[PDB]
């Protein structure tokens, strides 16, 4: 898809990612990484959540939406031309090979 997410050097980048919990309160583990989704987990991980809360975090990369309600959209603050590229958002729907892999294109200028 021709779908891009844009930002000028210095702005915050906003890459979207969503899921709908099977029941209220049942969170699904999610991970974010720089580069397209590999076999499992995230390539060059920047953030990770579990069935409770955020287990791995990195500065600049935050889940500022209601992640508890399935809004796992990412915020990359103060972007550089180095931040340009594909980003993986892996929604780890429980069970045998059920994962929702989202590749998101970020373009810095």
């Amino acid at each position, epitope marked *: 898809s021709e779908v891009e997410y844009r930002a000028e050097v210095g702005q915050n980048a906003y890459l979207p990612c969503f899921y709908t919990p099977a029941a209220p309160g049942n969170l699904v583990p999610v991970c974010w990484g720089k580069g397209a989704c590999p076999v499992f987990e995230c390539g060059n991980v920047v953030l990770r959540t579990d069935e409770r809360d955020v287990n*791995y975090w990195t500065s600049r990369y935050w889940l500022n939406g209601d992640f508890r309600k399935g809004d796992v959209s990412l915020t990359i603050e103060n972007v550089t031309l180095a931040d340009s590229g594909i980003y993986c958002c892996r929604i*780890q729907i429980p069970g*045998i090979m059920n994962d929702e892999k989202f590749n998101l294109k970020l373009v810095i200028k």
Partner: antibody
Framework: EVQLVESGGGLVQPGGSLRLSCAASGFTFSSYAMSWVRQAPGKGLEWVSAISVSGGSTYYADSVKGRFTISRDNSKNTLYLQMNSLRAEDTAVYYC??????????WGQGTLVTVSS | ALTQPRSVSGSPGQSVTISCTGTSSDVGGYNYVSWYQQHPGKAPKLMIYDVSKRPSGVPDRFSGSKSGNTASLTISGLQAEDEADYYCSSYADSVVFGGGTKVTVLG
């Protein structure tokens, strides 16, 4: 310092069952995906199955899908492989490895699983 | 899905290179290629991951590259030690391994 110790291999009758364990030390097991990679004697490497960091999502090779079940106990820093409905083709050295996002940096000295009548 | 030469041989000090041919969905449109070294009664050793990334403890003389669908491990200045089996791996959609390559140090 990083150590992985496979246990549970031996001789199983075809159609039988076997449970492999892997004791992890030297790293934060709780924050890495894990997998099992097998090697038939004098043959090459074949990925068997993997488990997410949380343990909630599992991934399998078509050859073992339905028969094998990977599980983790982050509290005991242990990885398990439950092998059911075994066949001669499954005769291999089963390595337990630290899968990251598809690559295996640390491996244990594997356990031999022999499936013969 | 991944094809490697059965054997590559070189004299000590030679630059030698193992190819790994996959599809545009394996090695092509992804940077997810690893390389493992395996000596006789030992478990494999991660030599290169993410096409070129080299783990700590792997000598500088092991370099990883990719062109199109053909990933290449190049062992610059061969040593006797380097006599091992080498497997390439792709981990974009699933974990696949090449057939392996027996590196023979001739001298």
């Amino acid at each position: 310092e990083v150590q992985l110790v496979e246990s549970g291999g031996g001789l199983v009758q075809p159609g039988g069952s076997l449970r492999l364990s892997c004791a992890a030390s030297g790293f934060t097991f709780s924050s890495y995906a894990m997998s099992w990679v097998r090697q038939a004697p004098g043959k090459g490497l074949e990925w068997v199955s993997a488990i997410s960091v949380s343990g909630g999502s599992t991934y399998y090779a078509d050859s073992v899908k339905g028969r094998f079940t990977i599980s983790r106990d982050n509290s005991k820093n242990t990885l398990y492989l439950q092998m059911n409905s075994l066949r001669a083709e499954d005769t291999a050295v089963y390595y337990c490895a630290k899968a990251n996002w598809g690559f295996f940096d640390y491996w244990g000295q594997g356990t031999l699983v022999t499936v013969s009548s | 899905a991944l094809t490697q030469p059965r054997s590559v041989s070189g004299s000590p000090g030679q630059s030698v290179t193992i190819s790994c041919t996959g599809t545009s969905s394996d090695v092509g449109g992804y940077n997810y290629v690893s390389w493992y070294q395996q000596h006789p009664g030992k478990a494999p050793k991660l030599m290169i991951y993410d096409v070129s990334k080299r783990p700590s403890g792997v000598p500088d003389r092991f370099s990883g590259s990719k062109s199109g669908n053909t990933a290449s491990l190049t062992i610059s200045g061969l040593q006797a030690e380097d006599e091992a089996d080498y497997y390439c791996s792709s981990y974009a959609d699933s974990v696949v391994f090449g057939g392996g390559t027996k590196v023979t140090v001739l001298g």
